[PDB]
Point group: C3
């Protein structure tokens, strides 16, 4: 919200339009190591955040920071490769700028991916967790992308998140996972946002499991919130890249350097899976 003015979004959206023949309907934010989805697009038109009017440029990850309008599995997409994270200093109203821009672009759906740790034991590093809900930890303390005066033009002052992650798409996906006979069922769970670079400590790991979080991460939640605030049908997954050490028997890891899950075909499984799901995303056409 804060920082930009509606015309900032207007301006950026419009410029994007007057610069891409494409008019997307689906906005996809690729987590770490899931940027590969950008390869699944046709008629791809790449834009470096850099060259886009108000778009936050990136920090070190910048050397992996672009917005690509393509076409994914029978849907006008606009993938964002390399999202913005709070721990990079981006105030949340910047992290989520793009989600507000997309809405203005005409995007009606936002599929949000992300690599995350595993709090739930049943998760196996590599798994893919359908996000059914979220525990916005930094929001409790004020770190919410909607802080500041509300832009009625975008949405309500007190949006409900109880329904964030689309029930329809979550069912029309637990099923689709079945469809291609993916062996092990698409895990489903609650993702807990946690900001700050550092990785949880076993003590923190436990207050996260107790709170009910199935997976932990440092993003998504802010983009879901404003996507919701906008209307944007929202659904997304979480590629468990490493299991968090819930007890003092350490010497066992969960390194991001050890993102190799996302540095494997795990990321590839979630990518194809997201492409197929383009078919499950409702069209703005309808047609009975």
């Amino acid at each position: 919200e804060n920082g930009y003015t509606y015309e900032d979004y207007k301006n950026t959206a419009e410029w994007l339009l007057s610069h891409t023949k494409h008019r997307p309907q689906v906005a996809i934010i690729c987590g770490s190591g899931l940027g590969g989805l950008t390869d699944k697009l046709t008629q791809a038109q790449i834009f470096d955040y850099s060259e886009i009017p108000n778009f936050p440029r990136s920090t070190v990850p910048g050397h992996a920071g672009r917005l690509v309008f393509g076409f994914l599995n029978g849907r006008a997409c606009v993938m964002m490769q390399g999202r913005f994270h709070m721990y990079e200093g981006y105030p949340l109203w910047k992290v989520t700028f793009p989600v507000r821009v997309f809405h203005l672009l005409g995007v009606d759906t936002l599929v949000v991916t992300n690599a995350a740790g595993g709090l739930n034991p049943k998760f196996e590093v590599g798994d893919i967790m359908l996000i059914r809900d979220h525990i916005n930890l930094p929001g409790f303390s004020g770190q919410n992308p909607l802080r500041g005066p509300n832009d009625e033009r975008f949405g309500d002052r007190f949006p409900a998140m109880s329904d964030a992650y689309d029930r329809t798409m979550r069912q029309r996906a637990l099923s689709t996972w079945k469809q291609m006979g993916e062996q092990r069922e698409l895990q489903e769970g609650t993702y807990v946002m946690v900001a700050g670079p550092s990785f949880e400590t076993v003590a923190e790991c436990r207050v996260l499991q107790k709170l009910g979080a199935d997976a932990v991460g440092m993003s998504t939640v802010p983009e879901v919130i404003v996507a919701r605030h906008c209307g944007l049908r929202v659904f997304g997954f979480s590629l468990i890249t490493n299991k968090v050490i819930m007890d003092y028997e350490s010497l066992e890891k969960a390194n991001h350097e050890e993102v190799l899950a996302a540095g494997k075909q795990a990321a590839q499984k979630l990518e194809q899976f997201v492409s197929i799901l383009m078919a499950s995303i409702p069209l703005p056409d309808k047609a009975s």
Copy 2:
């Protein structure tokens, strides 16, 4: 604390004095839909935050933002209709400016009202929860109105909140509720502050119940903290305006638009109840 200087408070308080024949003893902050209490005052003298020297002006709610010095049930009041919330961008040292101003006005008691969600099942939308305690969620993370250098003139560096909500007034109220034979006993509980516009998700609803919160809201706590820091006898209620969905059987709501609880006579029950309680508030006179 921060942002203003002691003379900012001095100045504003004094101006208020040199502008109102009244010298209040009780400061009341009306929650959403409880501003009606302003109607229960006699010799009311209204001041738009706007016209008061350092008082934060409001955002959209501004079109419901004034401080009215009246007289409530045998007590010199100063009601604040439409409080400041963190999610409106007000840094906490602005949200709570008024509480510090009141103290300088001579106010010795602060009754804080607020509309909130219902985490405790025994609560019925419409209920009125006496605040016995609070879980300051944004304070854990730094969002405390006392951050910054401490003004010894106002209080201690490390105030205790263990005793925030006055035991005396809480008992001299559970009783008073009995007095007028109000049918169902005045519920009592722990209010949990949660900032950010958004409404909790079922996942968040559950970490709130587990933490021990009886009701959830986006205010009060900051004003209680500095009121305490000042001395200010503090007691207040929480008008359960909607029950929070603790489980995935949604399609059931808790809309603020659906503030109709506070958009009913519920707000009226708490208002009269607060007026009567003016009698239970100790006087600075004493007189055996």
Copy 3:
């Protein structure tokens, strides 16, 4: 991290070097009432934060704010008497400036002390809790000293804290406590950071015990995080100065004014104990 530039640290470290004949290996941050350790140093050379190039000066506690390079029990130290706390308005990247400076000074170990409340019943006011882990509460919400672009020169973007408090030194201390026959075993536990001046309320006391915190405080965690980010072997204790009231049978206290624990010989027991432990701290020499 943020606020300063690497050359700010470079500059301050170097100035410190070109101003102290000493080259420390161990950096000690004294909690409240544990500054006394400064008396256990030989060839002590005191520096007021004030006179050091980029070092945050202090607020009221300033009248107890210096960095003393001495020699503690056969180790080149650099004690910091009176640490910086978030609740004083210091952004975390200032609270922890010194830890980053020390590393540049050549310091390889950081022993962090702190006075804290007692959530665990088995703790007796006066006890000394070896910090085995921590629950960084303000970090979940964004208040992490590493927010902002990461300085690869100092460390990784996603440091692990699972191993923060050195296992070696924690065992080579539970033992050392035995060594001098200290009667009651060196308590060990999880410290929970909580910012904001205020002291927890019974409601907050309980969400702290439930989260798994053995003791509560308003510091250490930020300095541990960046110490870790740097490499810095980290271990530290927590002098339980008062038991937190976990239930509504109050009129029982935990005043910081009632820091007399730390205002006793309790602080003295932890101080000597820290001096002896200088012997357990590995040398950069090695020598079989």
